[PDB]
Amino acid sequence: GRVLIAGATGFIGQFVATASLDAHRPTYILARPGPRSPSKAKIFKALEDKGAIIVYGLINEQEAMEKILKEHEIDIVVSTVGGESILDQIALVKAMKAVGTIKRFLPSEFGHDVNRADPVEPGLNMYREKRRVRQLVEESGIPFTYICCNSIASWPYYNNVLPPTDFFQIYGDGNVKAYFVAGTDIGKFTMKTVDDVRTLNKSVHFRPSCNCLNINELASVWEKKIGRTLPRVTVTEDDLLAAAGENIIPQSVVAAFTHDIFIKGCQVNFSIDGPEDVEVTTLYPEDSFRTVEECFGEYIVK
């Protein structure tokens, strides 16, 4: 089962590609043509060494993607492209339909369930773009898996690194829960799901109980780590709405999501006991997530 990955130089994409390569799956990385960045070379260098095969294309040139999928015999397409590139997948989806041999498509999700969450603008528009990709995928009869992996384990700043060494900003009353997952757990479990029968045409929700925290709890973890207490200030819902209301890309969008998670609780306000939803810890029992304690642990390094 040959895996094509788009956006593997991305923040998420770097975690997923390494995981695929570590799972000793056959991995192709879609790369942009022409000369490249310094951090970009450090990624392509490492992936190639881990066995990665580099193919050159763009995901919005439909024709190019057809020649790429056909020639390299691709079973599985994982797209990890950033939030400004979401509508560029529309040509990729058209391409996958044309060649008709695809066993699984993962669109660029890696957040919340976009069909359940209702964020304010301009976060809302991003979700519109994602929902539209969903509609297109399903109508095209392509087999899919949606990664709803919630929050990457970093400090949850309003704009967007190291948690605050000065004072803590607590959203609302700070008693609203979220799920936090290590970058490496996002990639590893992602790659497990791709050819699991139980994830065919499903949303996969990452809900590890040990990593289910509110910002007060999350601040307290950080204080154990540093050995002393920092002050806590309240950032209000209104503070958040005002930052969203400025339409500054991408500062304003992150702010809409922050309102969705920590004011409105979008990550935890829905059941997953239905038949189109599955949860990672129950699909892979007795297989541990990394705790925020150990994630934050390594933030002390440096």
- Tokens 């008709």 -> residue: 100
Which is the catalytic residue, given 42, 70, 94, 130? Answer: 130
Cβ neighbours of residue 146 closer than 8 Å, sequence gap 6 or more: 106, 107, 109, 113, 134, 202, 203, 204
Residue 288: what residue type?
A: S
Please state, in angstroms and rounded to a whole number, the distance separating the CA atoms of residues 153 and 12: 12
Instruction: Give the CATH number of domain 149-182+206-270+285-302.
Output: 3.90.25.10
Three-class SS state of 151: strand
Pick the CATH number of 1-148+183-205+271-284 from 3.30.70.2190, 3.10.310.10, 3.40.50.720, 3.90.1150.10: 3.40.50.720
DSSP secondary structure letters along 98-128: HH---SEEE-S--SS-TTT--PPTTHHHHHH
Q: Are 197 and 278 in contact (CB under 8 A)?
A: no
Sheet-wide strand order for 178-181: 151-152, 178-181, 212-213
Known binder of ligand: residue 108? yes
Domain ranges of the chain: 1-148+183-205+271-284, 149-182+206-270+285-302
Query: Which of 57, 56, 50 is CA-nearest to residue 21?
Result: 50
* 264: annotated active-site residue: no
* Cα angle, residue 4 at apex, residues 32 and 23 outer, rounded to 5°: 125
Residue 253: what residue type?
A: V
Q: Which tokens hold the place of 120?
A: 């304010």
Euclidean distance between the first and the last CA atom of the chain, given in angstroms as a whole number: 40
Residue 278 pairs in a beta bridge with 204
Three-class SS state of 263: coil
Known binder of ligand: residue 12? yes
Known binder of ligand: residue 291? no
Would you say the CATH fold of 149-182+206-270+285-302 matches that of 1-148+183-205+271-284?
no
Cα R_g (the chain), whole angstroms: 19
Q: Are 293 and 210 in contact (CB under 8 A)?
A: no
* Cα angle, residue 290 at apex, residues 287 and 293 outer, rounded to 5°: 145
